[PDB]
Amino acid sequence: GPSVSELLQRALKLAEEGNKEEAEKLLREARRIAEELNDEELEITVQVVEILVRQML
Amino acid sequence: GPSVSELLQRALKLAEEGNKEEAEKLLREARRIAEELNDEELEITVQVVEILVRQML
Amino acid sequence: GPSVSELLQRALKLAEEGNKEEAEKLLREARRIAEELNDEELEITVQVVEILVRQML
Numbered sequence: 001g002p003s004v005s006e007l008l009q010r011a012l013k014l015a016e017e018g019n020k021e022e023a024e025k026l027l028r029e030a031r032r033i034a035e036e037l038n039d040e041e042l043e044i045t046v047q048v049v050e051i052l053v054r055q056m057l
Numbered sequence: 058g059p060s061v062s063e064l065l066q067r068a069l070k071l072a073e074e075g076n077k078e079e080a081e082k083l084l085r086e087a088r089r090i091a092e093e094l095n096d097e098e099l100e101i102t103v104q105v106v107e108i109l110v111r112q113m114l
Numbered sequence: 115g116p117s118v119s120e121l122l123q124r125a126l127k128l129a130e131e132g133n134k135e136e137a138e139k140l141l142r143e144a145r146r147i148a149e150e151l152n153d154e155e156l157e158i159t160v161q162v163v164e165i166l167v168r169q170m171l
């Protein structure tokens with residue numbers, strides 16, 4: 001699978017392109033992985049990038 | 058007690074609601090822990106979330 | 115040399131002061147170290163801090 005970091009990298013690139021729907025899709029999938037794993041570091045990583053994407057868009 | 062990541066997750070959610078005061082107190086604690094452990098990953102994590110929290114209105 | 119995290123923390127501080135020239139110099143170094151390490155966590159860290167820096171100026 002893609003790692004959380006690859007998913008979040010691609011979301012940031014898509015957000016830079018103004019591609020909201022595809023960016024947000026990748027964020028939901030990264031959040032799903034982080035929450036399934038109950039992984040605090042993945043959770044904060046996703047949470048930070050979620051905010052950054054919103055401001056970028 | 059709560060890890061740096063957990064404190065930062067809570068700080069972001071309070072700041073998004075509007076409660077700046079307890080958000081900042083969680084940032085202070087997260088920073089205290091990160092500096093005490095002398096952990097550079099935790100320090101940049103705190104520093105980024107500090108910026109994102111202080112960014113919201 | 116310095117770690118990626120150490121360069122990024124300082125790049126954020128320089129960007130806060132409006133020193134885009136110094137900030138971007140340390141970002142360039144942080145990115146080149148992260149890229150010879152093939153570290154996906156360092157890559158997303160560099161990417162996030164790049165965006166925050168470029169948002170403040």
Ligand SMILES: N[C@]12C[C@H]3C[C@H](C[C@H](C3)C1)C2
Pocket residue numbers: 044045048049101102105106158159162163
């Ligand atoms: N490890 C981190 C990567 C990125 C930058 C900072 C905050 C978030 C997002 C987690 C450190």
